[PDB]
Amino acid sequence: RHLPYFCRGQVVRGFGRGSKQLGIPTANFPEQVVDNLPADISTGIYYGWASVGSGDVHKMVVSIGWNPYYKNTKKSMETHIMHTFKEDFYGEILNVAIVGYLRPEKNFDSLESLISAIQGDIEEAKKRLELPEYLKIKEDNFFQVSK
Ligand SMILES: Nc1ncnc2c1ncn2[C@@H]1O[C@H](COP(=O)(O)OP(=O)(O)O)[C@@H](O)[C@H]1O
Ligand SMILES: [Mg+2]
């Protein structure tokens, strides 16, 4: 309904143990960004395009979830980019275009099932983003402003 959704924000650290531990780093935005998401934004896994600062546009998956820790029902958002970066990019601006929904949130009974699920989400996202209707979003002026 509110896709494609375009947003930008400073990349900020999270809490607990980072998903770098799984080889699947997930970048966070400040609360301000997540708070401006429409409500028709469901929790779950989405896919789209991302660039960092003035960099090239790459495929990405975004997880939108509920935040346990803030008062009121606040959400969380974290983006894994399907690109190998040589350096972290904290403080840089992440530009995202969320283009499609993959699945609702699910409960997993082990890290093995979780990690397999995440990997499968990434492979599915890669395939779907080849569809001409989504492939074109890579070229949106949204991403050209940041270069
Ligand atoms: N492919 C990538 N996708 C997302 N973040 C990446 C990627 N490569 C490097 N990073 C870096 O990894 C950080 C996220 O790591 P992570 O372990 O999830 O910690 P945290 O969530 O606390 O920031 C990002 O802020 C960014 O600096
Ligand atoms: Mg993370």
From Swiss-Prot:
Subcellular location: Cytoplasm
Cofactor binding summary note: Zinc or magnesium.
Cofactors, names only: Zn(2+); Mg(2+)
Coiled-coil features, chain-numbered ranges: none
List of residues binding Mg(2+): T26, N28
Annotated keywords: ATP-binding, Cytoplasm, Flavoprotein, FMN, Kinase, Magnesium, Metal-binding, Nucleotide-binding, Transferase, Zinc
Tissue specificity field: Detected in brain, placenta and urinary bladder.
Pathway: Cofactor biosynthesis; FMN biosynthesis; FMN from riboflavin (ATP route): step 1/1
Subunit and interaction comment: Monomer. Directly interacts with TNFRSF1A death domain. TNFRSF1A-binding may be supported by TRADD. In the absence of TNFRSF1A, interacts with TRADD. Independently of TNFRSF1A, interacts with the NADPH oxidase subunit CYBA.
Enzyme Commission identifier(s): 2.7.1.26
Name of the protein described by the UniProt record: Riboflavin kinase
Higher taxonomy: Eukaryota, Metazoa, Chordata, Craniata, Vertebrata
Catalysed conversion reaction: riboflavin + ATP = FMN + ADP + H(+)
Record-annotated active site: E78 (nucleophile)
The organism of origin for this protein: Homo sapiens
Gene Ontology cellular component list: cytoplasm; cytosol; mitochondrion
A Pfam family that the UniProt record links to this protein: Flavokinase
EC class (word): transferase
Function noted in UniProt: Catalyzes the phosphorylation of riboflavin (vitamin B2) to form flavin-mononucleotide (FMN), hence rate-limiting enzyme in the synthesis of FAD. Essential for TNF-induced reactive oxygen species (ROS) production. Through its interaction with both TNFRSF1A and CYBA, physically and functionally couples TNFRSF1A to NADPH oxidase. TNF-activation of RFK may enhance the incorporation of FAD in NADPH oxidase, a critical step for the assembly and activation of NADPH oxidase.
Residues that, per the record, bind FMN: R103, K106, F108
GO molecular function terms noted in the UniProt entry: ATP binding; metal ion binding; riboflavin kinase activity
GO BP term, pick one: FMN biosynthetic process
Binding, ATP: G14, K20, T26, N28, I81, H83, Y90
Gene giving rise to this polypeptide: RFK
